From Swiss-Prot, chains A, B:
Active site, per annotation: Y14 (proton donor), E38 (proton acceptor)
Lineage start: Bacteria, Pseudomonadati, Pseudomonadota, Betaproteobacteria, Burkholderiales
InterPro entries named in the record: Ketosteroid_isomerase, NTF2-like_dom_sf, SnoaL-like, Steroid_delta5-4_isomerase
Name by which UniProt lists this protein: Steroid Delta-isomerase
Superkingdom of this protein's organism: Bacteria
Binding site for substrate: N99
Organism of derivation: Comamonas testosteroni
Length: 124, 124
């Protein structure tokens, strides 16, 4: 099993890499065969290439990401609440998802699911 | 597909039924083939009898439960952050999970998974 300390450090590093626009640092947290489903209910992206492209695309505008409560981490999984803020054409948006990671035996993320709907998308 | 507003009202009903110690009102939110897994990594309880027993066990102590952020709801799923406190012989414990619900076509909860570990629990 993963330790909660490792899974919590990863979640913190994810947030910091998003804030830094550090694309390589984000992708390095994932397994080679990982999948990302964001938002929940959309079609999943699988493998390094598609995941790197997903994050490259999510970083087209500067993002401010804040973890907004403690990380929950138990049994090879972690969940966390956060916000992502950005501005486009003079309009600010703040999105507030809950993300879920599952980790493999080597401590890499094998699955990310980002759960948020239209009610979790707010004005800046 | 479920509505985010139906899912959100069920999360609030759940929380309200826990606070009132209303065992029937909790179990009525679940499908008769639902599974509950709390904490994540423990053996899942499946079906009405086991789900009623699971909540009867939770309700052996008085609970104070409150949502601590807005509910996330999309597709057929919801996730929520909350705290639960309870007291046994004058000693109080507070726990901060993130729960995830999946709902069926009829709007009942077909699966609840509760993520938290010892780092999210504070006794006395």
């Amino acid at each position: 099993m993963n330790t909660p300390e490792h899974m919590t450090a990863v979640v913190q590093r994810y947030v910091a890499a998003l804030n830094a626009g550090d694309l390589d640092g984000i992708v390095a947290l994932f397994a080679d065969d990982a999948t990302v489903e964001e938002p929940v209910g959309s079609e999943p992206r699988s493998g390094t290439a598609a995941i790197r492209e997903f994050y490259a695309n999510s970083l087209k505008l500067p993002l401010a990401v804040e973890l907004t409560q403690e990380v929950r981490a138990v049994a090879n999984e972690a969940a966390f609440a956060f916000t992502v803020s950005f501005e486009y054409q003079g309009r600010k948006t703040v999105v507030a998802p809950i993300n879920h990671f599952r980790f493999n035996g080597a401590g890499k993320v094998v699955s990310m699911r980002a759960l948020f709907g239209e009610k979790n998308i707010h004005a800046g």
